[PDB]
Amino acid sequence: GIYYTPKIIVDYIVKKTLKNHDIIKNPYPRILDISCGCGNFLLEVYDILYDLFEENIYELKKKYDENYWTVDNIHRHILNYCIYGADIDEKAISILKDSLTNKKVDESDIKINLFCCDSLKKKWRYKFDYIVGNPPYIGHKKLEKKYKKFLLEKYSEVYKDKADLYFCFYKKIIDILKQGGIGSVITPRYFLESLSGKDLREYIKSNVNVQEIVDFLGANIFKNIGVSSCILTFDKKKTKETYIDVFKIKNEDICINKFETLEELLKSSKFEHFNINQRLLSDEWILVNKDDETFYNKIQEKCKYSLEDIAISFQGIITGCDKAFILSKDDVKLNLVDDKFLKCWIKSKNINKYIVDKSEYRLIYSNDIDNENTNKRILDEIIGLYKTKLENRRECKSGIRKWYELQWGREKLFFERKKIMYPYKSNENRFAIDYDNNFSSADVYSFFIKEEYLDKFSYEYLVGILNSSVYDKYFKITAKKMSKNIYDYYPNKVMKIRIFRDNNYEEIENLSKQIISILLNKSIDKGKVEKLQIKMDNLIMDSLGI
DNA sequence: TTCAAAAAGTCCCA
DNA sequence: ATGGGACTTTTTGA
Numbered sequence A: 001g002i003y004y005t006p007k008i009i010v011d012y013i014v015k016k017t018l019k020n021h022d023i024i025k026n027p028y029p030r031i032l033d034i035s036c037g038c039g040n041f042l043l044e045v046y047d048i049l050y051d052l053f054e055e056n057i058y059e060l061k062k063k064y065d066e067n068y069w070t071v072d073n074i075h076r077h078i079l080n081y082c083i084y085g086a087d088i089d090e091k092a093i094s095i096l097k098d099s100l101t102n103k104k105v106d107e108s109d110i111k112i113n114l115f116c117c118d119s120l121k122k123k124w125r126y127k128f129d130y131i132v133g134n135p136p137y138i139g140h141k142k143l144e145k146k147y148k149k150f151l152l153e154k155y156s157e158v159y160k161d162k163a164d165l166y167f168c169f170y171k172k173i174i175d176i177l178k179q180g181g182i183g184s185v186i187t188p189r190y191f192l193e194s195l196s197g198k199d200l201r202e203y204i205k206s207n208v209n210v211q212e213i214v215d216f217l218g219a220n221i222f223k224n225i226g227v228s229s230c231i232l233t234f235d236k237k238k239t240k241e242t243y244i245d246v247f248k249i250k251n252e253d254i255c256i257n258k259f260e261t262l263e264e265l266l267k268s269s270k271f272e273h274f275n276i277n278q279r280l281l282s283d284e285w286i287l288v289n290k291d292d293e294t295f296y297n298k299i300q301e302k303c304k305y306s307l308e309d310i311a312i313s314f315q316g317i318i319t320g321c322d323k324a325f326i327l328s329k330d331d332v333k334l335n336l337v338d339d340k341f342l343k344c345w346i347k348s349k350n351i352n353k354y355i356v357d358k359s360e361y362r363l364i365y366s367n368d369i370d371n372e373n374t375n376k377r378i379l380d381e382i383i384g385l386y387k388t389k390l391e392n393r394r395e396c397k398s399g400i401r402k403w404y405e406l407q408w409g410r411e412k413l414f415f416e417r418k419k420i421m422y423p424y425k426s427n428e429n430r431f432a433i434d435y436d437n438n439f440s441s442a443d444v445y446s447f448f449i450k451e452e453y454l455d456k457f458s459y460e461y462l463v464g465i466l467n468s469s470v471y472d473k474y475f476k477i478t479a480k481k482m483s484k485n486i487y488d489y490y491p492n493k494v495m496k497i498r499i500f501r502d503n504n505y506e507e508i509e510n511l512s513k514q515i516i517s518i519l520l521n522k523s524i525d526k527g528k529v530e531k532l533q534i535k536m537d538n539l540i541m542d543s544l545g546i
Numbered sequence B: 001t002t003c004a005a006a007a008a009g010t011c012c013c014a
Numbered sequence C: 001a002t003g004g005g006a007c008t009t010t011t012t013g014a
């Protein structure tokens, strides 16, 4: 449970918080890491501090106690008054204490401000000038329930339904930062856009001045770790300035060690830089450049409806154990199941633009099985193979669901109708019209048009514009970037997409119908579809004035 | 009763 | 062995 931050990032963070420190004015800075681990950040802080003190040793000796300020006394001073670390791992603290002791190589048995504790529970007796480090990331599934009760009761300003632990670490760091202090940390990027991060974003916006956001997007910073990172730097300084420097990466395939320093990478063509006014932040943080801001605002102003206005959205089936209820359509065991119980089953990869692949799987809609005696063959020879796993589901332990029932079988009538489907995680917009009453898991989302908006919007028109290049860019501006070439397509953002209706409605609809007709051929002339899409994109750009 | 969010993702191969 | 690519379950709070 210990993660090594790359040295280039560690150096950038420490330098970010200490480059302009006035050691003459304040020779007693407090630099804290509340998840210090083996001291990836703190040892570097020691190096920076030692150079800072030794470069001004004679100035300090003249302004202050001349006997206290010598080179020989630097190592002691740093440990007594400057470096502070906290971590839950005892072995890590022991190792870091030995490393800090070996920075000099007893005289008086120097005390080192290292605490082996839960930083979210520690009674912190004073605030700190500088806070750096890499907090732990633990999500809603992997966090202990008993501990989650404490977080919900005590960190309710940032920790709620599906929040993450590092939300609480952000709140703690902000709370124990001195007036005029500086904090710089590396966390997941997901709180910048996620629905769970709304309270955290409000807290950060309204309690600190955000200096800088480095967004690495899908680039893999931590080797062999599936997480997407960002660096946040904030302060509590009295300033009328309220502008943020945003560095957003341009090529996610870059390796982090191209130059000797991260700042060389940030100044290069690998990153784009722009400024965001913190006072103009809403509940969402729309961090885009002026071209994209103009693009987004044009679209928002022009469109008079949203998908939420005109549609009904729902998440797919959650069986609770897929292997028990999902079978290949050529499985011999499917001869045991009456066709009234069987539904077509698709995965996210089966969703293309405008149409769905033919399904290869069948769902046993076991909610329609009455009792265990009439269909004993289905239960004993198909579903019962996983009975233990099925009995451990939450709604079975509580007794709400029978052991063979789907955990969340939703409502059949919602699926057995003409509707639009899209994958929950994709590199591009893929909205299809489903004609075959397809069921799917939560990896696919569905919506259908309300009855009162059918005369205004058709499924063909909607899949026309939603699959356009304009709308790919428009959705990705505010979407949640998960990993390299993966965006979240969830209703909490998909339903916010704004749509329009003007003189180009009929031609866009006709082009969409032609695309759908071609895609459903035996001899698919795939080429002409691209030409038709280009023409449709021209129509949409004409419609939205871009 | 029953919705929808959640990557320190998961798994595989060259 | 690692780094990169294809693909995506069900646990969980509200």
Ligand SMILES: Nc1ccc(CCCNc2ncnc3c2ncn3[C@@H]2O[C@H](CO)[C@@H](O)[C@H]2O)cc1
Pocket (backbone or CB within 6 Å): A001, A002, A003, A034, A035, A036, A037, A038, A086, A087, A088, A089, A092, A117, A118, A119, A120, A134, A135, A136, A137, A144, A147
């Ligand atoms: N059972 C159990 C339940 C909940 C928790 C959460 C406790 C949160 N409070 C914590 N307080 C201090 N340090 C913590 C910490 N959680 C993780 N670390 C350290 O962060 C580094 C980055 O990974 C590593 O060196 C971890 O050892 C911990 C255990």
Ligand SMILES: [K+]
Pocket (backbone or CB within 6 Å): A061, A062, A063, A064, A065, A066
């Ligand atoms: K003096």
Ligand SMILES: [K+]
Pocket (backbone or CB within 6 Å): A217, A218, A219, A220, A221, A226, A227, A228, A482, A483, A484
């Ligand atoms: K990543």
